Design an enzyme around this catalytic site. Sequence first.
Site, short mmCIF file in Angstrom:
data_model
loop_
_atom_site.label_atom_id
_atom_site.label_comp_id
_atom_site.label_asym_id
_atom_site.label_seq_id
_atom_site.Cartn_x
_atom_site.Cartn_y
_atom_site.Cartn_z
N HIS A 9 36.31 3.12 90.46
CA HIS A 9 36.30 4.22 91.44
C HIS A 9 35.35 5.36 91.10
CE1 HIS A 9 39.07 2.20 93.99
NE2 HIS A 9 39.83 1.93 92.95
N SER A 12 44.30 1.06 95.26
CA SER A 12 43.07 0.36 94.79
C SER A 12 43.10 -1.08 95.28
CB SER A 12 42.80 0.53 93.29
OG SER A 12 41.52 -0.02 92.96
#
Length: 317
Positions: free
Chosen positions: A212, A95
């Site tokens: 996400h 991430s």
Amino acid sequence: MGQCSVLLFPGQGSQVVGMGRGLLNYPRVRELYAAARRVLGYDLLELSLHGPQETLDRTVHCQPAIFVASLAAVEKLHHLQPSVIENCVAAAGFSVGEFAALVFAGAMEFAEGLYAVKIRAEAMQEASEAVPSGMLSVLGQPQSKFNFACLEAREHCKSLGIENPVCEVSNYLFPDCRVISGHQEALRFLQKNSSKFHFRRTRMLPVSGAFHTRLMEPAVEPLTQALKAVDIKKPLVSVYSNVHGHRYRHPGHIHKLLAQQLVSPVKWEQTMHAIYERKKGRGFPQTFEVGPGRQLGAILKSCNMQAWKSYSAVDVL
């Protein structure tokens, strides 16, 4: 003799009060934190070392804190084991970790990467405020019905009056283990019905929003604009993207991929599968987790026990 290395860069979740203390004595580290303070407008080092804990855990602060501590961790490793950095064949970041990995690889400069992370983090925070959402870590098994589970959870949310509910896989961690993120009510529904979908175990993550997923769509344009100001170069070591678990290729595509990463599941299990493939008769690389915590080592152990035998972490405490 020389073994190739893989560097793994942690993400949100790995921060901890005190991070950085075990880095400050290493050349170039204090300079990184000074340069961060310039980009950010506040004393990142101080927040990293001493807290408050809840403040450091806020997505606006933990993202840059982790970025800088990871790159600082690179400096420590370079000092202690320079051949490990010289022999690096692959990097991957979870991430926000993708930004430190791209900086490590020479694709972006430190201050550029940090600016992008700052904007990413501010924008994700603001997106999280728009509607109550979250992230649920789920341990399933071959027979887990992840998709049927998400559909039932969205259907449930509609019955509650939520428009276009979100409930979707947001992270693929390791075999049969996923994070599912979306509207808070969908996640509550999943926890209550866990055994219905042959989930073995679930845990709500301590994050502000459904990262996400499409609920981060409001963050895409701000991040996109921030990356417009950045000159992304070809990575000098292979960097595997969260978006598809494949290596970045044309650098002119990277900025689009980073904007897509924001709203797309983190394909981390896929990335571990790709990185740890070895050519016939060739050796296992040494893995270094460069940043706070050992969470990526725990995930690696679940993906590839053999690769994990040559895993180490750079201690940032």
